[PDB]
Amino acid sequence: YAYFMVGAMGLLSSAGAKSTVETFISSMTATADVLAMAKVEVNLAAIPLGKNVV
Amino acid sequence: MAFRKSNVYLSLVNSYIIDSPQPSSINYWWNMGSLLGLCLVIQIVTGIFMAMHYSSNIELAFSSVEHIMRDVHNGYILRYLHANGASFFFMVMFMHMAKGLYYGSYRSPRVTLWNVGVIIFILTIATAFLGYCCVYGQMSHWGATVITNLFSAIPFVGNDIVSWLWGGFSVSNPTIQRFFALHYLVPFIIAAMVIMHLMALHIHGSSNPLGITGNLDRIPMHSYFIFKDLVTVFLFMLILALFVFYSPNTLGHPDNYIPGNPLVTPASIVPEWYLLPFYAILRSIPDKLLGVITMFAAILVLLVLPFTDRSVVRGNTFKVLSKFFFFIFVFNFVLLGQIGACHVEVPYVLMGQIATFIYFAYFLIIVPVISTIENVLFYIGRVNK
């Protein structure tokens, strides 16, 4: 019984530690507006033959 | 009983600055270590007074550096002193390393000390890269890109971790923001590690230059070695002044002074002088994962030096071949750095590969066989039959 109580405490503590660490770590991940997947168009009419357009 | 050794806040300082029986035969290298400590503290102080007037956004990071350059009274001195003191700190740390390796301080009774130290080494390399990113010039942006992407060599999942550390899919506000915050954080962790370094040192004193027992006689710390530190720190101040006033832009490279532009990069992109030795071995072997692992493997092969030096006689003050090989190794190290600086063409790939081979070979196999030969020669010379 005593070891079961200690194990229950450890289980709850481990779940909580996992949750807190996940919170802190996911704090640093990419935010929302940075996920703006930009789209661009390029005009190919006036590009020179032997030139590189970036 | 004397008040110096009674009050706790002073009983601590007594045993480390006022009464610490250093060995009799000290030379200038441990004074050089004290110089390094003072370089660290002045770096911290000028860094505080730097960040006092430094912004953090990506759009207003370069403008912040020009602002600290001119629009603050007596401020250009702060910025140049920060940069050149950092470079001089790295050089003096390299010389601290080379000293330690030569005189055999890495013998067994100080392995904890030596490990802690190399931890400061790797931390400090990280700090230098972090700050160089904090500048965000032109080539610092590409350096940050490459070193962040380094972790993508990790098997299976490599893109998620780099994208996490890199704050998104592009170098943007979170990237430099996090880099600067971590740069401003880490040196205090360095301070904690170096107070541990001092703790680990105090257990067994400091090694003799002769590589022999120093418990016989010792002379008190203060009023003798404080001035040996003073002379060398004055030399440091004057040489730093010479490099900060008359010759500012020599140690660094004249490329940081460009606005960040992730569209064009110059064909000549190199790290600052104190990262060339590892960059050379990285660009030497023709693989991604191999290079990424072999950098930290260079650090680890530094680590492996104890319980490998199997000379019963400590140090390299009485081994002609061993000291000759150490000199070939240090000149190897400088050659490695310089070839890393130079461009890679036909006569250089072989040069660099051979350089890395002899480097790691000196760490692994040169020390044991040469040491054993020295030991057996020492035995055979002075024995009849």
Place this chain on the structure above:
Amino acid sequence: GPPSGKTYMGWWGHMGGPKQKGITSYAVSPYAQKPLQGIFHNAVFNSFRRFKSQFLYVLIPAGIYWYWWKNGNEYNEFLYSKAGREELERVNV
């Protein structure tokens, strides 16, 4: 206080070094002698003796790597000097 591990150096009085008898030291105090004794004679003579003793250990490695560096530079120069069509191709691969 909490006892700690064994240490190879004690403090004053229990320093831990081998006990000795018959050794006699001396001193003359800083104020009774000229601070700069020898200053020049010892400077020049000991400097030259020390530089003579260890000359080769720094001479040989420097010479070896200088020879390497010179050979590499000269070959690199020859490579890209009116030789990019007859020597560069056959060694680049």
Place this chain on the structure above:
Amino acid sequence: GPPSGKTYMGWWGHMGGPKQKGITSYAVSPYAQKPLQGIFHNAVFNSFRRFKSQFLYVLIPAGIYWYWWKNGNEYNEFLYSKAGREELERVNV
């Protein structure tokens, strides 16, 4: 370490307290004890007796200051209630 000053508490074995004899401490071990031997009787009775024995020490100051605060408040809103010309000006001004 260097010798330190005299202290009235030490480490285990040299506590430094007065030497005792005849004291005989016992124990029961936590496993074979059934922790909550008293959990409702002890709780209610001890809690109420302890609340009784230290009741006045907080009732008196709190009541004093509550009375003070109530009087101050009531006078304050009496000031700003059809009395700003007759009562306000005789103390405020």
Place this chain on the structure above:
Amino acid sequence: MTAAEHGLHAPAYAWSHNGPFETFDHASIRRGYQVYREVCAACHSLDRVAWRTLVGVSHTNEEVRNMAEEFEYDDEPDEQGNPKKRPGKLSDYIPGPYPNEQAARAANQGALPPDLSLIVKARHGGCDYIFSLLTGYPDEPPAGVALPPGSNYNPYFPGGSIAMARVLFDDMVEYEDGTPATTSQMAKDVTTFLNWCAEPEHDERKRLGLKTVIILSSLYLLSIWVKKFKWAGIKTRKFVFNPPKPRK
């Protein structure tokens, strides 16, 4: 500290979103935004919320765009450097109708129109206080009180003088069905909307709080038990004194 300068203390209304386990009634945010866009119009700002967070909370996926292509945002120039206007996209904020600041003080006939994006999180009380301001106007101005021209009275504004009138009349929104012509309804919608926009994280916050409080309560009780357990090895030890033999 007179009553006139401080305003009526806020009442205790029986909110719908209040309570430790309650989310928003955001079947009405869908119309709270509608009424806000109709009636606030070019007066208040709300320039802190991004159209990528009204999706999945009040609007499904595509309506947010289908109004986002009705604005302009002045993005990057063409090959000639002339700045160009393009239709709005899904990750751009709502434009404050008054361009920079000055047209605001030119049109309100008075002070700056306070930013609504965080207003109801930035007033004393506040959850009811905005409701009180919106419905507190007496239908007839109070008798025997001086009032500067233009400004209208308020029994709730500290100081009793508000620069904005009361445009909260009846039968002027008509959301989709039979519901308007009750100014309390529009007030309720707008206050719920602003309470959401002050923090678009109410639901998730409440859920995480419930999870954390349950976990912590269980952990705390377990810790109580374990403290009672291993401390019991000394909370019951008994000492028995013996008079030592008197010999020395």
Place this chain on the structure above:
Amino acid sequence: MTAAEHGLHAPAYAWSHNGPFETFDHASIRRGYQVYREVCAACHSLDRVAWRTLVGVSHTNEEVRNMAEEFEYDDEPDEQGNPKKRPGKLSDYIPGPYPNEQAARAANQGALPPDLSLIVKARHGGCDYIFSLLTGYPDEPPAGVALPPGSNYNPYFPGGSIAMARVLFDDMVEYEDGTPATTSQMAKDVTTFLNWCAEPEHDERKRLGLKTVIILSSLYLLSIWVKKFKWAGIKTRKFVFNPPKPRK
């Protein structure tokens, strides 16, 4: 890597201010600015330095105000919200004629022109290599090299191709005196001017450096002496080992 793409190493010119004690000859900045404004008008930027630092190093005072009365800088909005423009003052930066970035690639028929404000700090061999580049151009490109039409050659630039229209001719500036109309003069003046604008702090930097060097050398010698002094209390000691009687 070949010398063609590496660029000729800059010859070590014996520059006037390249000395431990020498200062900027800002008897020449007074015309360096003149030539810079006259010839490099609508091509580069110099958009970093503020006019409140030219006074007291190059110009007297009222001249900078008289020049600032020629540019406009978009003052704060008026009462009606219509933006206005007001003449510049002693807290403004020089405006590069290209508005933001796009006209740069529109007009140069090439790439962006770097801001000269720090250019001679960000090239190897900074002090020179700009005089070298401005006067090192040859009249006729070396035989056997093909270049894109409309571009110009420069053997000193890495790659040997630059979009610099060689506007460094003679009989063009005529500063105030008989000195211009030789292409060395304008190049030299602009070189010193730019070397100043990268750090308009050289004079006091050199003075302070001289003070520090003298103080530190004196303190170094004193410290050497004192170390030789108090260390002598142990360096001169002696030992006379008298072995004990072998009794045990």
